Amino acid sequence: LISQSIKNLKGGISQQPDILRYPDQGSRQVNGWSSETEGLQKRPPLVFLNTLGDNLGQAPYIHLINRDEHEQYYAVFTGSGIRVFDLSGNEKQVRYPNGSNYIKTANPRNDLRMVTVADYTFIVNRNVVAQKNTKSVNLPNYNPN
Amino acid sequence: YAQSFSKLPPNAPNGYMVKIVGDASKSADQYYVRYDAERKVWTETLGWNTEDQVLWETMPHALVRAADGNFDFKWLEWSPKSCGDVDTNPWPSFVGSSINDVFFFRNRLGFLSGENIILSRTAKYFNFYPASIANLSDDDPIDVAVSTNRIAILKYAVPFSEELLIWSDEAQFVLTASGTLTSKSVELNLTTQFDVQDRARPFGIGRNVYFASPRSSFTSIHRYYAVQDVSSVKNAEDITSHVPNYIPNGVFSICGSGTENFCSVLSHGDPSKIFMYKFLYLNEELRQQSWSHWDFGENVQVLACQSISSDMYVILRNEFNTFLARISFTKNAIDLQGEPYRAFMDMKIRYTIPSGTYNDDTFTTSIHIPTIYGANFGRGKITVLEPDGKITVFEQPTAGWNSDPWLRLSGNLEGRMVYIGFNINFVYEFSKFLIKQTADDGSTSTEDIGRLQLRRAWVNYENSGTFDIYVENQSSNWKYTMAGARLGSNTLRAGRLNLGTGQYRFPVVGNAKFNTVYILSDETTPLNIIGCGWEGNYLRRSSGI
Amino acid sequence: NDVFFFRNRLGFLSGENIILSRTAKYFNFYPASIANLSDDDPIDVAVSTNRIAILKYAVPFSEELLIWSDEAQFVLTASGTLTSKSVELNLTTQFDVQDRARPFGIGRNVYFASPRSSFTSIHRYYAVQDVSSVKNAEDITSHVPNYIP
Amino acid sequence: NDVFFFRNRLGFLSGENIILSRTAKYFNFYPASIANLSDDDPIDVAVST
């Protein structure tokens, strides 16, 4: 009559068949939090702050900005335009002084980028290609003779 | 057209330009001067026919906080070409193709195209031209293309440990110079050829950087890291090598964090789950693999959570209304002022009850659900928690909650500042309790030769409880429900928490190959599982080896 | 914040900025002459990362000065000698460090203080044995996690 | 045979020859000027075996 104890439960799925897999590895695990000292726990809940919508871009590109402790906002890049929430959940206004013409994309996940430093928050479209403009030259013709 | 700077006319009135050609004594290009005067001076200006600026809206934009409090999405200015002609100033090589994934490699500024690296001049941004073509001074814009033999349209760049490191698919790279950075110094050579799909930016975390790798139709997220023995050789281990078929092959975010030491990858082939990867490193060795759903409901599409230091902020869809949501990894805390008992609800709101809800005819206070929230709900089990020990479970109606959002409790609950949440579904199966034995090397291998008649596995638990246990044979289905503490314990109170401490023994009777023990519960209450044992008769007839 | 002593230069930290002095004399953050860049100029390299790093404490050990923001650590070297065009300033790891206490000593190691809620997770930063210039940060509260308030 | 892409140069292989281009433009296997060897010249190293 034998017996053995599995000391830890860390952790998680192992879709490898059960005569191969290690102990500590369950076959499914939902809402678990395999910590270091304590084993399985429930994941801590979702507080509500607060709400913002009706099912925002249908599939958007969302990337936060984390400048200071008092300065922590989002950036939601919907198919229509830029929308910014804070970290308390209310909307804050953006403005298009130069036209949008750059965020209107069917797939803003696959096509928009955002590189962010404390001085500048770059927003990159990947579909658009950048050309030279033929309007502003130095001299119009200038036959150099 | 003069042949040197010394051979140059004295006055040459104000609207006049000279193409200074090379002296054939220095390695010099052909710069232009343009007397300007009001002051007898030959400067250096732009070419006459070449044009100065880019199309200047198609360039990458930015948003600025500017101190009204509201943002504004603007083009930023781009410094025009003015030092010479084309091509002593060539057009920078993104002028035909698209840009993506802007660097910050130096106090230069970099662009990526396929296949192009376009760095700026140092100490000022958005000036991709030399200051002067009297000579190549230093600190010029840098146009190195790529150094490979296979097509690499050149996506995300991430830095770690020595370098910036510029990930195309099927190539990784090394971005260095030999000494300092000039336009002639930049190395830009290959590292490996691991395949990386480019929809989610590869995140963090510590010494490692975590991929997202494409398959059909189950992704194979790797872990990119510098090896120990060589100085500058990198390797990409799969961390889904034992869980291969699990993530549904569209990856738009990798959230991650460093304080609680876990990676976490959202998916879009099944958007209602947040996958997890809990790990820790001790003595430069992995000691914990983990993969887990977090599940928020039946149809709750999860937008990209991001994690400020120990707070997971999540955005969800319903699909009636979206909302922000915080997950805080605080252990012995209180979410909202006026607990008992931290309540692990899913979707807590301390909703005080207004004056007019009660009617003394039917003796029922009733709560309209989006007057708490602003949102209508698909499904779930809304539980309601009082500052007293009351908990009511409501068990969503057929075609609820949107048909009748109405939360009917009791008679008089107006000033009670009540807590309203959901239930989480906590699920944990076990592996089938075989004889795990770590021999001959490590890599613990089972022995499945004789019939392992299994009996009474046991689960020990730290300071929580009320998980059930479901033991599931082929046709048995026993459920070993459990509650908080033993009778007479100091933990068991006529009102306080009911938590308790292990162990707990419960019969798992039958063959090992057929018994699947698992722990569903529900709840508004935590649990802890420390270890699990089992005993049982083992009899292998054929005495092996 | 968090003034260097990296050379006989003198350094400042801003977000995101490194401001070194001229050599052999302090508090002169300008070149001696702009007849040319001679050598030994003040150095203005900003940062080389893709994530916001307001740039706190700097501590030296074993090869380098080593300039800790939160969520980034760094490497402060040059290729050869130090000019304004020479300074490397590139990433090492991305371990999270709260910046209220200066990370102290001690021998070969440097000890963090890492933020959680609401029990800190003090690490131990050290150079690994096998690589030349790869560092790692083990948790030394990994078995006592819930202890420091 | 077996054309490189080693730099923004362009390379050829012969037996025994390496023929790299000048940088930043392809298909120009000659120096820009013989006022001096400037930099970025075409490269003709044969083999070392």
Numbering used by the authors:
A (entry chain v): 3 to 57, 60 to 149
B (entry chain v): 250 to 794
C (entry chain u): 349 to 497
D (entry chain w): 349 to 397
Question: What do the authors say?
Answer:
Escherichia coli bacteriophage T7, a member of Podoviridae, has been used as a model for understanding the DNA packaging mechanism common to tailed phages and related dsDNA viruses. The phages package genomic dsDNA into a round procapsid using the portal in complex with an ATP-dependent terminase complex as the motor. At the beginning of phage infection, the tail is responsible for receptor recognition, and the portal and tail act as a tunnel for DNA delivery into the host cytoplasm. Here, we determined structures of the DNA packaging intermediate and mature capsids of T7 using cryo-electron microscopy (cryo-EM) and symmetry-mismatch reconstruction.
Subsequently, a 7 Å resolution asymmetric reconstruction of the mature phage with a portal-tail complex at one of the 12 icosahedral vertices was obtained using the symmetry-mismatch reconstruction method. The portal-tail complex structure is similar to the previously reported recombinant T7 portal-tail complex structure. The portal-tail complex was reconstructed at the same resolution of 3.8 Å, although the core structure was still smeared. Another two independent local reconstructions focused on the portal and tail, respectively, yield the structures of the portal and tail at the same resolution of 3.8 Å, suggesting that the portal interacts firmly with the tail. Twelve copies of adaptor protein gp11 assemble around the bottom of the portal forming a ring-like structure and serving as the base for the assembly of a hexameric tube consisting of six copies of nozzle protein gp12. The dsDNA is embraced by the 12 tunnel loops in the portal, which have a weaker density probably due to its asymmetric interaction with the dsDNA groove. This dsDNA density terminates abruptly at the interface between the dodecameric ring of gp11 and hexameric nozzle of gp12. Consequently, the terminase complex cleaves the mature DNA genome from the concatemer and disassociates from the portal clip, followed by the association of the tail adaptor and nozzle to complete the phage assembly.
